[PDB]
Every structure is written in C-alpha cells, then in structure tokens.
Amino acid sequence: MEKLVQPTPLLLSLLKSAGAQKETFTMKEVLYHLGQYIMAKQLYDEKQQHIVHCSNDPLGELFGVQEFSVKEHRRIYAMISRNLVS
Numbered sequence: 001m002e003k004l005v006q007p008t009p010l011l012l013s014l015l016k017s018a019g020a021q022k023e024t025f026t027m028k029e030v031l032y033h034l035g036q037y038i039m040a041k042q043l044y045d046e047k048q049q050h051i052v053h054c055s056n057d058p059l060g061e062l063f064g065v066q067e068f069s070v071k072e073h074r075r076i077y078a079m080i081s082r083n084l085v086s
C-alpha cells in the first residue's frame, strides 16, 4: 500500500490548478500533478529542460528556492514534505 498525504494550502492550490481533484494523494500523485503544473506554467528551462525556474512563480515561495533540477529527487521530496499537514 501507499501512504496518502495531505498537501498544505499553497501546494494543494497548485496541484488543483494542474487538474487535481482531491485533498489526499500518494507521493507519486503529488509529484505527477506538480510536474503537470510545471509543464502548464512553462517553468522549465528552454535549453536545459530538466531545470525548473521558480523565481517568477508562486512555486518559488512554496518550495523556498529559485531553481531546481528534476534530477534532484531527494531535494524535491524534501520540499514536498515541508508542505504536508503533519
């Protein structure tokens, strides 16, 4: 089985803008919708497309960074865990 987690308000709002419909998700579902948000907002770098630019988007406040690479899975997981109801 997989644990169902509960995104805090800001993260949840970004997930729902990407199409998410519920309030609890597996981590796989959180990541998927977050990736969809990034694609929709065109936050990825044009030239190195694994790089995500947050400096001009609310995602930047949420995570607390300016850029991250989708290769940094531990960093991304950490940023998400900071934004779950404990």
Ligand SMILES: COc1ccc(C2=N[C@@H](c3ccc(Cl)cc3)[C@@H](c3ccc(Cl)cc3)N2C(=O)N2CCNC(=O)C2)c(OC(C)C)c1
Binding pocket: 031, 032, 034, 035, 036, 038, 039, 044, 049, 050, 051, 052, 070, 071, 072, 073, 074, 076, 077
């Ligand atoms: C070569 O370009 C790529 C390569 C891989 C990813 C990626 N890889 C996936 C991923 C990344 C990190 C983790 Cl921890 C798990 C899965 C997933 C994802 C999930 C969460 C976040 Cl915050 C960002 C991306 N994520 C994506 O969402 N992708 C993958 C392919 N299909 C998509 O719809 C876009 C990618 O994401 C963009 C949105 C930047 C771009």
